[model samples]
Target: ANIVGGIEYSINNASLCSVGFSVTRGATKGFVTAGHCGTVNATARIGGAVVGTFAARVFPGNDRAWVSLTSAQTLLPRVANGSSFVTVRGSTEAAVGAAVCRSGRTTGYQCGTITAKNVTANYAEGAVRGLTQGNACMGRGDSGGSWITSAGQAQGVMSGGNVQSNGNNCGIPASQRSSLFERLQPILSQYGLSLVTG
Candidate 1:
C-alpha cells in the first residue's frame, strides 16, 4: 500500500488515529504517530488490512511512536491536504510566531500561529514535555497527525489539545486554545529516522 501522512490508521480494536509522516532508518521504512495510540509491537491496520507494526513508543515524557511498514507497503513524502497533496520538502522547526497548519481525521485542516516552544502538555495520560505549542483547533482522534508549515516544511505531530467551552459547545477561542505537538527533529534524531522528502 502507498501510504502518506494524515491518513487514518486503525489501532488495537475500534480506535483509530491519524498517521504523522513516513520515515526510514537504513533499510527499514515506517511512519510516525502519537505514542498514546498504541504500544510497541501494536497491530496497525489500514483499510481493514494489516500494514505495519509499531516498533517503538513513548508517552508521559513525550508523545511519539514509529511503525515499521510491512514488506508490501511503501512510504510517500506527501501529506493529505484536502483533495490535493502537500509535498514535504524537509523537517525544519518553524519559528515561534510562524504560521502552522495541521490535518487530522477530526478536523481536515486548521491553521494557527506558533505560540511557544519547549512547552509542556499535561494530558489525562501524563505530562508530555518539550512540545511546540500553537493555537490550532483539534478534536479527538486527531493525535499523530501532521503539523507542517504553510511553506511545506514538516514541524511536528499533533500530540494533544486544550479545547475551551462556550456554554453549549467546545471549540478553540481566539488565542485561547493551545495545542501541543512533539517536534519531529528530536524524534528523527533519537530514532535515527530520516524524513522522506519529496
Candidate 2:
C-alpha cells in the first residue's frame, strides 16, 4: 500500500493516530509519529491492512516514534493537503511568525503561524519539552499529524492541542487557539534515520 503523511492509521487496531513524515533506515522504509500513539514493536495498519511496525518510541519529555514499513508498503515524501498533496522538499526548521500549516484526518488542512519555539506544555500524561507552538486547529485523532511550512519544508508532528468547552476547535483561528508539535530533528538523529524526501 502507498502511504503519505497526515493520513489516518492505527496501532494494532486501536489508538488511531495520524502519520508523520516518511523516513528510511538503509534500504528499509518507515514513518514517524507521536510515541504515545503506540508502543514499541506494535503493528501499524491502515485501512485494516498491515503497514509497518513501531521500531522505536519515546514519550513524556520527548514524544516521537518511527515505524519500519513492510516491503509491501511505500512511504512517500508528501502530505495530504485537502483534496491535493504537498510535496516535501526538506526538513528545515521554520522561524517564529513563519506561515505554517498542518494536515490530518480530524481537521484536514489548517494554516497558522509559528508562535513560539522550545515551548513546553504539561499534560496529564507528563511534561513535553522542546515543542514548537502554533495556533493551528488540531483535535482528537490528530496526534502525529504532519506540520509543514508553506515553502515545502517539513517542520514536525502534532503533539498536543487546546480545545474550548465545545470539546472541539475545528474552525478556530490561530489567534484564539494553540497547539504543540514534537520537533523532527531529535527523532532523526536519535534513531539514525533519514527522511524519505523528494
Candidate 3:
C-alpha cells in the first residue's frame, strides 16, 4: 500500500502516527510529521517497509520533524480523509472561527472550528508555544496527522488535545474537546522546505 500524507506510519514498527505532509530538500525526498513522533535517526516504516529515517526533529518548544526517504519510497502530495483522499494544494493559515478539518489514523476525519491562535500548551514533555487551537478532538495515534481545510489549504499537524477528558473515545463533541496544532508556515520556512502540493 502507498504511504501518503495523513496516513498511518510507524516508528521503529512499535508506535504509530499519522504523516503530516510530503516534502523535498534539493534532491532528497521526505515527509514532515510531529516532532513528538520520533527522534534523530529513528526509522519510519509503512506496511513493514523501511520508508524513511528521522533527519530532524524538535519537540516541547515546537512539534515538527522531517523524515528522509529511501530511494525506494516516494512522497505523495495528498492526504487521506476517511476513505477518500484530498490534494494538498498549499498552506494558508486560517483565522479564529474558521472551519477546519483533520485526518488521522485513529478517527479518520473530523471537522471543527478554529478557536484561537498562538496558544501555548504545557504538556508533560514541556511547553509548546505558538499553536493553533481548534475544537476537533483527537485520540492516541492521531498525533502527526494533517490539519487541512476543505478548500485544500494545508494548515498544520496534530500535536495533542484533551480528547479523553470527558469522552470515552475519539469524536468528542466540539464543546467538550479541543486540540492544538503546530502551524505549518513557520516550520516549513524554518526548515527551508516546500510543501509537496498537487
Which candidate leads in lDDT? 2
- The number of the candidate with the highest TM-score is 2
**Model 3 clashing-pair count:** 0
Assess the local accuracy of residue 186 in candidate 1 as a C-alpha lDDT between 0 and 100: 85
Q: How would you order the candidates by lDDT, starting with the best? A: 2, 1, 3
* 23-138 per-residue lDDT for model 2 (tens digits): 89899889989988888899888656788789988877778898888888888888989878889898989989888998865666777788899988887778787799877777
Tell me the deviation in Å of residue 153 in model 3.
0.7
lDDT of 1 by residue, 86-188 (tens): 8999898888888898877777677788889998778888989779877777677778879887677999898876644431112645456667788988889
Off by over 4 Å in 2: 164-167, 170-177
Off by over 4 Å in 3: 1-3, 165-176
RMSD of 3: 2.1
Residue 192, model 1: lDDT of: 88
lDDT scores in order: 0.81, 0.83, 0.81
Provide the TM-score for each candidate, comma-separated: 0.92, 0.92, 0.91
lDDT of 3 by residue, 1-198 (tens): 455777788898777788888888888878878888889899988656688799998876988888888767777778887678888888998878999998877776877889999988888878787789887767778888799898888898888865574432345655666788899888888778888888
